[PDB]
Swiss-Prot record:
InterPro entries cross-referenced by the UniProt entry: Bet_v_I/MLP, Bet_v_I_allergen, Plant_def-hormone_signal, START-like_dom_sf
GO biological process: abscisic acid-activated signaling pathway; defense response
Compartments (UniProt record): Cytoplasm
Effect of residue 47 to S: Slightly reduced interaction with BV16
Annotated family: Belongs to the BetVI family.
Recorded GO MF terms: abscisic acid binding; protein phosphatase inhibitor activity; signaling receptor activity
The protein's name: Major pollen allergen Bet v 1-A
A Pfam family: Bet_v_1
Effect of residue 28 to T: Slightly reduced interaction with BV16
Primary role: May be a general steroid carrier protein.
Primary subcellular site in the record, as a coarse category: cytoplasm
Biological classification of the source: Eukaryota, Viridiplantae, Streptophyta, Embryophyta, Tracheophyta
Gene: BETVIA
Effect noted on mutating residue 60 to S: Slightly reduced interaction with BV16
GO cellular component, one term: cytoplasm
Organism whose genome encodes this protein: Betula pendula
Amino acid sequence: GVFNYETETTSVIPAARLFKAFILDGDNLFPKVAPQAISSVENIEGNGGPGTIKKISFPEGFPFKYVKDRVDEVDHTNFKYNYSVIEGGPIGDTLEKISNEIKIVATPDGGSILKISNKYHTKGDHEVKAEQVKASKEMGETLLRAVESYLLAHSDAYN
Ligand SMILES: C[C@H]1CS[C@H]2C(=O)c3cnccc3C(=O)[C@H]2C[C@H]1C(=O)O
């Protein structure tokens, strides 16, 4: 099956700045600002364009050791990022991949919202494991909030 889980996260950070930092520079920021969520991010192949593979490692204790993610598309002006989880972590058993689409939109007050869709490709009619759905929500919050906090503490970053 293909099962879609969506999130709408409100952020006080303006959209262009948040896209530049959180989406396009998380390989740097995530291990820096959220080491208790992500221990390292390593480029595996590619230069950041479509088809680029990276390895995200998690600190010891988490159920998973790593995932490999693939960049699908980046739309720099519309603040849209498409990427897939293709190996490691939850990939195995009845789950083949997670296809993700993130879009950051400005809000009237000058902040932003992140529209997040995670589409899980599972075997047949097998559902996504509830623990995965939960862990994904937790990770997204930890990472976004940590980058937000960094941006608010460092006004000269990503202007
Ligand atoms: C670097 C790796 C980190 S995990 C993940 C993540 O949890 C997340 C959650 N909510 C919105 C956006 C995102 C992410 O941009 C991605 C980034 C992901 C990747 O680019 O391959």
